[PDB]
Design a protein that fits this description.
This protein is of the alpha/beta class. The protein has one domain. It contains eight helices and eight strands, in the order E-E-E-H-E-H-E-H-E-H-H-H-E-H-E-H. An eight-stranded mixed sheet has the order 1-2-4-3-5-6-7-8, with helices on both faces. The two termini are 30 Å apart. The relative contact order is 0.15. The structure holds ligand QU0 (2 copies). This is Polyketide synthase Pks13.
Length: 277
């Protein structure tokens, strides 16, 4: 079922069988988010999921790649991710092609960059914690105390979350460990994405593109309110296919919208099966 950070969603047969689909977890989720999609792919398509690991996007990809190669050798690799999962899947594609492997398909499920660039100032840090508090108040129906932003401004990201945690606690909200963990790791995944530089990629990428970011995303980061038609990826990917799916970011992995992703993706997998012969 789960081996290290690999989840089997559908095991491959001992020999032969279709090309496996590798899916990568989003922020604050496991790879069980990909079950609806699995149900929209051909019968007997294997699927394996990469769960969370620590580091820069690059350092995460560096841990996934040894395992991808252990499971699939030379290729063909099919790599899919929703949201952060999409960033991870693409990082892995970069790395696999550089090692001389065969990546046939990268499917970014609404992995869309913020419409504008995020400063790097002490003011932005203050504003981001403000937005996080408003999100946490709405999401958990609690009161978050005002933070003294001096002596937090100067810390790194982990130092910043540690301090906000001590502040929430000292105000008298005891947070379940599971929730502390989840929100810390999600926040740090967001920071990993933001500080990563996207690398050019001369393979085929498919971007499944929703209409907009959902409310909580826009509340957390207002720049998600604006989208480039190419999701920010046209800069880096010469062979980019953009498939419109409608709806919001958060509905992209739910029915009915995942039927569009699944239909399109099935034909891609069909072509790949036709050629392995
Ligand atoms: C559901 C997975 C996924 C990837 C789609 C997701 C993960 C996390 C979030 S969140 O961080 O922005 N909000 C969460 C806040 C929380 C964290 C930890 C413990 C309890 C709660 C929940 O509200 C989310 C959630 N949705 C549901 N539904 C039943 C819709 N349950 O939890 C949003 C979507
Ligand atoms: C830390 C608190 C919380 C729950 C609000 C949060 C914030 C930010 C993220 S995120 O970094 O994973 N943001 C996602 C959009 C979203 C917002 C909000 C919720 C889910 C999802 C995509 O924006 C990622 C993503 N980046 C890209 N790029 C191309 C850079 N593609 O997808 C995740 C949870």
């Amino acid at each position: 079922q789960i081996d290290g950070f690999v989840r089997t969603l559908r095991a491959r047969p001992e020999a032969g069988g279709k090309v496996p689909v590798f899916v990568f977890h989003p922020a604050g989720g496991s790879t069980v988010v990909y079950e609806p999609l699995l149900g929209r792919l051909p019968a007997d398509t294997p699927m394996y999921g990469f769960e969370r690991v620590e580091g820069s996007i690059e350092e995460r990809a560096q841990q996934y790649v040894p395992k991808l190669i252990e499971m699939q050798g030379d290729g063909p690799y099919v790599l899919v991710g929703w949201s952060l999962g999409g960033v991870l899947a693409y990082a892995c594609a970069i790395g696999l092609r550089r090692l001389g492997k065969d990546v046939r398909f990268v499917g970014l499920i609404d992995a869309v960059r913020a419409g504008e660039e995020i400063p790097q100032t002490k003011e932005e840090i203050r504003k981001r914690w403000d937005r996080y508090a408003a999100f946490a108040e709405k999401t958990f129906n609690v009161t978050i105390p005002a933070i003294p932003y001096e002596q937090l401004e100067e810390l790194d990201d982990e130092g910043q979350v540690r301090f906000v945690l001590d502040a929430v606690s000292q105000s008298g909200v005891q947070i379940p460990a599971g929730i502390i963990e989840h929100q810390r790791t999600s926040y740090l995944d967001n920071r990993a994405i933001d500080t990563a530089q996207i690398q050019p990629y001369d393979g085929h990428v498919t971007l499944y593109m929703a209409d907009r970011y959902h409310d909580d995303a826009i509340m957390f980061e207002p720049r998600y309110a604006v989208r480039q038609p190419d999701g920010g990826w046209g800069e880096y990917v010469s062979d980019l296919e953009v498939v419109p799916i409608g709806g919001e970011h958060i509905q992209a992995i739910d029915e009915p919208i995942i039927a569009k992703v699944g239909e399109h993706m099935s034909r891609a997998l069909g072509q790949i099966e036709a050629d392995r012969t």
